[PDB]
Amino acid sequence: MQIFVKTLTGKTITLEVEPSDTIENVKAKIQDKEGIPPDQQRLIFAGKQLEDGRTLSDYNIQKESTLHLVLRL
């Protein structure tokens, strides 16, 4: 499936993912495309910050869901 990743500016990123991919897998995909290191990425879906180890379906993130990306220093 494909999902979207939206930053605070509204810039949207398109990822191709399996519902089985972990949040770490997804952060690495964001890192390749965007150059943000995973430890500086906060992903947020349905008002909750996601866990590195957990997977996309653990959060019932499905095809075309939009995750929000927020920085950290």
Q: Pick the piece of the chain touching another protein (CB under 8 A) from 12-20, 30-38, 44-52, 53-61.
A: 44-52
Secondary structure letter of residue 54 according to DSSP: S
For residues 44 and 52, what is the distance between their CA atoms, to the nearest angstrom?
12
Cα(63)–Cα(73) distance, rounded to whole angstroms?
30
47 forms part of the interface with another protein (CB under 8 A) = yes
51 binds another protein (CB under 8 A): no
Residues in the chain: 73
Q: Shortest distance, CB of residue 56 to another protein, whole angstroms?
A: 16
Q: Using CB under 8 A, list all residues that contact another protein.
A: 8, 42, 44-49, 68, 70
